[PDB]
Design a protein around this ligand. Structure first.
Ligand SMILES: Cc1cc2c(cc1C)N(C[C@H](O)[C@H](O)[C@H](O)COP(=O)(O)O)c1[nH]c(=O)[nH]c(=O)c1N2
Ligand SMILES: Cc1cc2c(cc1C)N(C[C@H](O)[C@H](O)[C@H](O)COP(=O)(O)O)c1[nH]c(=O)[nH]c(=O)c1N2
Ligand SMILES: CCCCN1C=C(C(N)=O)CCC1
Ligand SMILES: CCCCN1C=C(C(N)=O)CCC1
Ligand SMILES: [Ca+2]
Lengths: 359, 359
């Protein structure tokens, strides 16, 4: 089975091609993770996935999506991740982390608590920052503060500091969050970036924040550990042909800047879109990025069917398959997949105290 | 649906009728549980089961099955369970524990490490104790030493000490392990008990160790928390009619002695048997014990299909359905069952960070 072949990137070897993508838990307090996360991540890692990327973790407090988001903006925050890292490794999985800044989509309620921008009366809220003073709209009407050159320099340095802290916590895989309409994606998109300085206007200028951040992080992140990023390569906003061409060119520049793998996603930069949600709908998009930018890729958004995952690998659309919600439903989904694809000794996808009894 | 009705017994209310029965993990060292257990139990509790009975926990070192079995024979051992109790409660489940003594089946290898008696030259082994100096046979050939009267007093007191510790660690449900061929079962069975003192021969005498242990535990275990036991009510040894009749009379005496619920199982006292394994095969046996002894019951051994569980409850065969291996496969099996049975807002069997997304 393609899905259960190992994968080696730099010095890291994954035991199979199942990745658990970052999934916000909204259970942290002041950025600090706790027993919610400890058990959540340890249980999924024991489930058999080869790679577990920890949820979007804010590089600065204002970079959280919500008051429940994890952070890594101080050494105390980083120390809190050490037992999560070590529990993932003890299970035989590889620990990764996604470091993030929510940009204009920050200062929002938890999804099951309204999922909308926090109101001004509410004392949980904070001022948001973005390339331009323009609101997402819809359920996120708050207008961000337009970043100055000093802000841009400060945020870049926050990504660098976060990467250094991830390294020292023991993460073996890092993912820069340049997707889903948050700070990085919003610098790239003409929808949200109306700057007239070096960071807006042209393709080179709009790309600049992303490329400068990647290069700054590259200076502290170990050369022998995968350096990856997540990027929304189209919006389904009526501009897909040109947007995707630009996105793929940026992926070529990521590669020339030392990126080891790209997690291919959707932009979500504005609400006025028509995303054609469906089983494995990103497969052919990821394939095009992979082939044209000549870079390893993963993608998500409809692969929790073991046959869909296997198919995407056999078609060389993906190098890793990211399976999210199915792991929330069943933290041992990788075992389920091994059974469903007829892997020999499928139960030994799991640790002995389970595997012995399930074969 | 019947599966998702609450259950109240003494001061304890279970949020549904799904119980996770005790399942040995063989991952402890010198009886001390560790991070294996912490995550294992916390993840299953978050999966939605109403009751989680912690694995067979030895009241004394020689009463472990294996060198990996959990123990509660010191206050340090009991303190190790406190975070497990706390995590089970935090998940909305009720924490229980099974306290145990393996009798002549003790001093064995872990199941994936041969599953047989440790040989005499292996320094990991120990002398075993039992009512009479008779081996189980087959893969457990070691002959136990016959217990003295002082041994019997000491082991009863170890059960008392274990219950006291379990109480103080915060467990809300206790289960005495009088099943599966271990020490208690072996006092009751004529196959293993050939004693000629007060603890063997007659039905009263064979019952004595079990009834005295129950009464001694009852003195320390709070009256407002369920006091339960697991007991093998037949062997499938060609003596089932008489064995079942005696087992049911013993169950009546347990009830008279303050037992709140009986977990109905198979004796496994000797290897020379013909157990008719199949889906829910214990259902009719449990029903008969329930009806004739007038005690609430649970059972296991083939109920991990949601329809089989639901059917057993509607037929009033069981008050709680114990689902073991399906929870090793999927710690969130209770959510899977809620979906399979068409429970409304089934995803909210799980905590919010999962339920919101799975709706
Ligand atoms: C609870 C939850 C939380 C998040 C997500 C989604 C969900 C369900 N996703 C998107 C996620 O990584 C993935 O791409 C999607 O879930 C699609 O994959 P599945 O169809 O769920 O396998 C996500 N994406 C990301 O880049 N960083 C993150 O922290 C989050 N957080
Ligand atoms: C790994 C493992 C370990 C144990 C068990 C079984 C398994 C699979 N079982 C028996 C268990 O509680 C249950 O009765 C059986 O698993 C049958 O139920 P299922 O068919 O698995 O739902 C068990 N029984 C018991 O009384 N105390 C225990 O500690 C153990 N340990
Ligand atoms: C962005 C649209 C839906 C996917 N989600 C992504 C998140 C992320 N942190 O990238 C958080 C919630 C949902
Ligand atoms: C006689 C074996 C029945 C199932 N098991 C029960 C155990 C028990 N501790 O009661 C341990 C292993 C297996
Ligand atoms: Ca011996």
């Amino acid at each position: 089975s393609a899905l259960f072949e190992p994968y080696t990137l730099k010095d890291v070897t994954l035991r199979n091609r199942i990745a658990i993508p970052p999934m916000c838990q909204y259970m942290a307090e002041d950025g600090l993770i706790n027993d919610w996360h400890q058990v959540h991540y340890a249980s999924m890692a024991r489930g058999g996935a080869g790679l577990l990327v920890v949820e979007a973790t804010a590089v600065a407090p204002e970079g959280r999506i919500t008051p429940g988001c994890a952070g890594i903006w101080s050494d105390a925050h980083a120390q809190a991740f050490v037992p999560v890292v070590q529990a993932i490794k003890a299970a035989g999985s590889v620990p990764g982390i996604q470091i993030a800044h929510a940009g204009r989509k920050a200062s929002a309620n938890r999804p099951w608590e309204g999922d909308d921008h926090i109101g001004a009366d509410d004392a949980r809220g904070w001022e948001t920052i973005a390339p331009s003073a323009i609101a997402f709209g819809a359920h996120l009407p708050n207008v961000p503060r337009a970043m100055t050159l000093d802000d841009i320099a400060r945020v870049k340095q926050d990504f660098v500091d976060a990467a250094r802290r991830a390294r020292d916590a023991g993460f073996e895989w890092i993912e820069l969050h340049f997707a889903h309409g948050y700070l990085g994606q919003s610098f790239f998109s003409e929808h949200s970036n109306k700057r007239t300085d070096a960071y807006g206007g042209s393709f080179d200028n709009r790309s600049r924040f992303l490329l400068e951040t990647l290069a700054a992080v590259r200076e502290v992140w170990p050369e022998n550990l995968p350096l990856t990023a997540r990027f929304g390569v189209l919006e389904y906003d009526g501009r897909d042909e040109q947007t995707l061409e630009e996105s793929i060119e940026l992926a070529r520049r990521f590669k020339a800047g030392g990126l080891d793998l790209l997690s291919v996603s959707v932009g979500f930069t504005i609400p006025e879109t028509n995303i054609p949600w469906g089983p494995a709908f990103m497969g052919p998009i990821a394939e095009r990025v992979r082939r044209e930018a000549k870079l390893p890729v993963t993608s998500a958004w409809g692969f929790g069917t073991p046959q869909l995952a296997e198919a995407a690998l056999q078609a060389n659309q993906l190098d890793l398959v990211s399976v999210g919600r199915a792991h929330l439903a069943d933290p041992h989904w990788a075992y389920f997949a091994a059974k469903e694809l007829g892997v020999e000794k499928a139960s030994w996808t799991l640790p002995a105290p389970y595997a012995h009894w399930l074969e």
